[PDB]
Amino acid sequence: HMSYTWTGALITPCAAEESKLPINALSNSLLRHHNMVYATTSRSAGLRQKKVTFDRLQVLDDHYRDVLKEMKAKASTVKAKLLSVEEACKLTPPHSAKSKFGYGAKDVRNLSSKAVNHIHSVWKDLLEDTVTPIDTTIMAKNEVFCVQRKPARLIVFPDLGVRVCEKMALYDVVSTLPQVVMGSSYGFQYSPGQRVEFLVNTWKSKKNPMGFSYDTRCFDSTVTENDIRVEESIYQCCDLAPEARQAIKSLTERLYIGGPLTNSKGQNCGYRRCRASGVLTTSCGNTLTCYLKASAACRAAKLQDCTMLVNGDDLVVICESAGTQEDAASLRVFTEAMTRYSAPPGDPPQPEYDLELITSCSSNVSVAHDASGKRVYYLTRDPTTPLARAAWETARHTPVNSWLGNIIMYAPTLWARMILMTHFFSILLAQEQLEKALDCQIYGACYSIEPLDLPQIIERLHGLSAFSLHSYSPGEINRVASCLRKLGVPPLRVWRHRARSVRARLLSQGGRAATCGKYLFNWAVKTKLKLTPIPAASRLDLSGWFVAGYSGGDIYH
């Protein structure tokens, strides 16, 4: 029951890999300790190969079979539709990996003959053959981090032709089914602001609240053939077209169960017997499996009045505390049950009695004050990775602007407002790129966003409180300050000074740019302007946002 078996061939790159931080004229205004910032390359893939290769022991009890019975019952109410080639072709990101059949993502999007004719022949083969393993490509990811070096994470994905067919058969399923099965526990249905409301309300709902979070050591590699087979039966509970049932069955047996791994040089690297990281069902199947395992473990641990919040492998549990001594024991049992379900932890969970202490999605809840001085809870995180990645994005244009994603999702935070908003609006002003659409990742999906619509966007997911946040917790300010010292980032006083200029340059331009300067940079000036609800904020067509997660799913909205 090994996750992977390797022939010997190496995980080869598709190009020359840049590991050191590229420097330009704008770099030093943000970061000075360039050596601390790096990117991962195929040279450290062998380390991760060793880390992701292990044997899986799974023991399934009555708690497991009970939860699944309930899950299949809720799943039976779902009616899902098949997607047309055209619909699936428009969901493909513009820079998605090109086919080994002589066409790219842009040919797929333009609905070219070579692309559409190939998509049709792959679909026909999926309905006619349900046994032959589908070929996947194994690659080492190029991600930017700060030191204290991590080995490169792997990405396993099928051909562009298979990916369009996956969307056709399972896009509606992976988008609709998770909320029906899990209700209010599906985290991807929440905006950052709505997620806080849920956590705070849930914490307040308990007499003596206890909370903890769970992180699985290599979740994708812990996923067994049984787990993937169990996910298929959940999808098969839906009311589906006959063509969609055969395509799901086929994709399961040929792609999702496992298959061979191929490098950039066309060599067989080995065989995969766990979850593929770069398929449409990556996020859905991980959330369902984690939820099934954790719900049954919650029962095994005899945890009182549980409230789960799942998104991929990330899980948060808020319940009624039975005393510190019993609470430590309950969590030991939870861990032991999860381990038997083929999901051991990275670090053992610990009971927490303060919401600000729970860490999930590399984040935590913190307290700040709004304009009136009323306490307001918001979601934050350590700025080290966002800043290291913003530093890379200062010197090089990338397909996913992390800074933009971070400004959208962490808008109320001290670091995103003072550093990110200031630095990039200063660049967009200078380069006259204020009206240019930029791509960013939100819950694993790719979105083209206009930087001028940022104030309206921030109001819908955080409310007017985000533009008025002050008097941050001592611990948060200390975390930002230590991080700036570590990376050689100018202190927050220099950022205040720059923000007044950015604000002034923005206000001068009028229209949407003045609204940007007015709302986003009100914190910089002493003579504050009245920030009222933006009429434009309500008009925003945010349909498609916070519906589901698509990490590794190759989705574009």
Ligand X SMILES: COc1ccc(-c2ccc[nH]c2=O)cc1C(C)(C)C
Q: Using CB distances below 5 to 8 A depending on partner kind, what does residue 456 bind out of Mg ion, ligand X, none? A: none
Range in contact with ligand X (rule: CB under 6 A) among 33-41, 187-195, 225-233, 423-431: 187-195
CB of 377 to Mg ion, least distance (A): 26
Sign of torsion, CA 310 171 461 183?
negative
How far apart are alpha carbons 132 and 252 in whole angstroms?
11
Residue 219 found at the interface with Mg ion (CB under 5 A): yes
CA atoms within 13 A on the CB side of 108: 33
x/- track of binding to ligand X for residues 300-319 (CB under 6 A): -----------x--------
Q: Using CB distances below 5 to 8 A depending on partner kind, what does residue 187 bind out of Mg ion, ligand X, none? A: ligand X
For ligand X, which residue of 366, 441, 465, 468 counts as binding (CB under 6 A)?
441
Instruction: Specify the residue for token string 């999007």.
Output: 109
CB of 398 to ligand X, least distance (A): 14
Report the b/e string of 328-354 with b at 16+ CB within 10 A. eebbeebbebbbbbbbbeeeebebbee
| Strand ranges inside 427-493, DSSP E | 438-442, 445-449
Residue 202 found at the interface with ligand X (CB under 6 A): no
Query: Of the two residues 315 and 318, which places its CB atom closer to Mg ion in the complex?
Result: 315
Query: Of the two residues 383 and 405, which places its CB atom closer to ligand X in the complex?
Result: 405
For ligand X, which residue of 96, 363, 413, 465 counts as binding (CB under 6 A)?
363
DSSP string, 218-261: THHHH--HHHHHHHHHHHTTSB--HHHHHHHHHHIIIIIS-EEE
Query: Of the two residues 53 and 268, which places its CB atom closer to Mg ion in the complex?
Result: 53
For ligand X, which residue of 158, 178, 192, 270 counts as binding (CB under 6 A)?
192
CB of 454 to ligand X, least distance (A): 14
CB of 421 to ligand X, least distance (A): 14
Q: 327 labelled as ligand-binding?
A: no
CB of 202 to Mg ion, least distance (A): 23
User: What crossing angle do the helices spanning 225-235 and 62-75 adopt, rounded to 10°?
Assistant: 30
How far apart are alpha carbons 188 and 283 in whole angstroms?
10
Q: Which of 291, 101, 104, 255 is nearest to 170 (CA)?
A: 255
Query: Of the two residues 96 and 363, which places its CB atom closer to ligand X in the complex?
Result: 363
Residue 264 CA: distances (Å) to CA of 9, 12, 42: 11, 6, 11
CB of 16 to ligand X, least distance (A): 28
For ligand X, which residue of 118, 163, 195, 417 counts as binding (CB under 6 A)?
195
Instruction: Specify the residue for token string 């790096």.
Output: 38
For Mg ion, which residue of 107, 172, 232, 313 counts as binding (CB under 5 A)?
313
Residue 203 CA: distances (Å) to CA of 179, 208, 308, 463: 21, 9, 12, 21
Enumerate helices (H) and strands (E) in the chain, giving the number of each: 21, 14
Instruction: Considering only the C-alpha atoms of the chain, give the largest distance between any 2 of them, rounded to a whole number of Å.
Output: 70
Query: Of the two residues 298 and 449, which places its CB atom closer to ligand X in the complex?
Result: 449
- Contacts with ligand X in 536-555 (CB under 6 A)? none
Q: Using CB distances below 5 to 8 A depending on partner kind, what does residue 17 bind out of ligand X, Mg ion, none? A: none
Q: 314 labelled as ligand-binding?
A: yes
Tokens in use for 253? 């047996």
Asked if residue 365 lies in contact with residue 355, where contact means CB atoms within 8 angstroms, the answer is: yes
Query: Of the two residues 11 and 404, which places its CB atom closer to ligand X in the complex?
Result: 404
Q: Using CB distances below 5 to 8 A depending on partner kind, what does residue 363 bind out of ligand X, Mg ion, none? A: ligand X
For ligand X, which residue of 287, 330, 406, 522 counts as binding (CB under 6 A)?
406
For ligand X, which residue of 36, 160, 288, 379 counts as binding (CB under 6 A)?
379
Query: Of the two residues 283 and 342, which places its CB atom closer to ligand X in the complex?
Result: 283
Residue 405 found at the interface with ligand X (CB under 6 A): yes
Three-state SS at 499 = helix
For ligand X, which residue of 187, 193, 344, 517 counts as binding (CB under 6 A)?
187
Segment (H or E) for 454: helix 454-462
Q: Using CB distances below 5 to 8 A depending on partner kind, what does residue 384 bind out of ligand X, Mg ion, none? A: none
Residue 200 found at the interface with ligand X (CB under 6 A): no
Query: Of the two residues 186 and 334, which places its CB atom closer to ligand X in the complex?
Result: 186
Query: Of the two residues 115 and 290, which places its CB atom closer to ligand X in the complex?
Result: 290
Query: Of the two residues 361 and 531, which places its CB atom closer to ligand X in the complex?
Result: 361
Residue 216 found at the interface with Mg ion (CB under 5 A): yes
How many Cβ atoms are within 10 Å of 471's Cβ, its own excluded? 10
Q: Find residue 368's DSSP bridge partners.
A: 376
For ligand X, which residue of 4, 171, 443, 472 counts as binding (CB under 6 A)?
443
Query: Of the two residues 252 and 441, which places its CB atom closer to ligand X in the complex?
Result: 441
Sign of torsion, CA 308 310 313 315?
negative
Q: Using CB distances below 5 to 8 A depending on partner kind, what does residue 219 bind out of ligand X, Mg ion, none? A: Mg ion
x/- track of binding to Mg ion for residues 169-208 (CB under 5 A): ----------------------------------------
Pairing of strands 136-140, 259-262: parallel
How many Cβ atoms are within 10 Å of 371's Cβ, its own excluded? 16
DSSP string, 351-413: -BSSGGG--BTTEEEEEEE-TT--EEEEEEE-SHHHHHHHHHHHHS--SS-HHHHHHHHTTTS
CB-based closest residue to ligand X: 405
Q: Which of 236, 228, 217 is nearest to 254 (CA)?
A: 228
With vertex at residue 466, the alpha carbon angle to CA 381 and CA 527, rounded to the nearest 5 degrees, is 125
**Contacts to Mg ion by CB under 5 A:** 215-216, 219, 313
**Contacts to ligand X by CB under 6 A:** 187, 192, 195, 311, 361, 363, 379, 405-406, 409, 441-443
Binding-site residues for Mg(2+) = 215, 313-314
Binding-site residues = 215, 313-314
